[PDB]
């Protein structure tokens, strides 16, 4: 029930305006997706999912997803995050940030620009695969 690689979603309405600088205070590598403003909705009668970011988070040692959730809530506020997911395939999850994983492309998801990925704490995907 512990892991090193995690992902979670952040939504503009429920994060502080200085959320990115606050993540920059943590001591773990992260990759932040481009803004996902054009993802297809799962809600009957809507077109777009609520604009959000995806964060790929690399713990230093094996930890629980709950521990990561509590850490981000203490940093960004209780309303900032509902849950944290474990990542088992870190390369595919990195590519998912721009919907360029094989599964994202199979599902015809909206492709984003890799230039809009933000790396914190010298994230380098080659180290984690
Ligand atoms: Cl930290
Ligand atoms: Cl962006
Ligand atoms: Cl850690
Ligand atoms: Cl951690
Ligand atoms: Cl833990
Ligand atoms: Cl995964
Ligand atoms: Cl997918
Ligand atoms: Cl999509
Ligand atoms: Cl596209
Ligand atoms: Cl890249
Ligand atoms: Cl750095
Ligand atoms: Mn998305």
Residue numbers in the entry: 4 to 132
The authors write:
RepB, the replication initiation protein of pMV158, is a member of the HUH endonuclease superfamily, which includes proteins involved in the replication of plasmids, bacteriophages and viruses, as well as proteins with roles in DNA transposition and in conjugative mobilisation of plasmids. These proteins are characterised by the presence of two conserved protein motifs: the HUH motif, composed of two His residues separated by a bulky hydrophobic amino acid, which is responsible for the coordination of a divalent metal cation, and the catalytic motif, containing one or two Tyr residues separated by several amino acids. Each monomer of RepB comprises two domains connected by a short hinge region. The C-terminal or oligomerisation domain (OD) is a helical domain responsible for the hexameric state of the protein, while the N-terminal or origin binding domain (OBD) carries the catalytic active site and is in charge of recognising, cleaving and joining dso DNA.
A very high-resolution 1.50 Å structure of the OBD alone was obtained. Although the crystals grew in the presence of ssDNA of the nick sequence, there was no DNA bound to the protein. The main differences observed are located on flexible regions, such as the loop between β-strands β2–β3, which includes the residues coordinating the Mn2+ metal ion (data not shown). However, alignment of these two structures reveals clear differences located in the flexible loop connecting β2 and β3 β-strands and in the loop connecting α2 and β4, due to its proximity to the DNA.
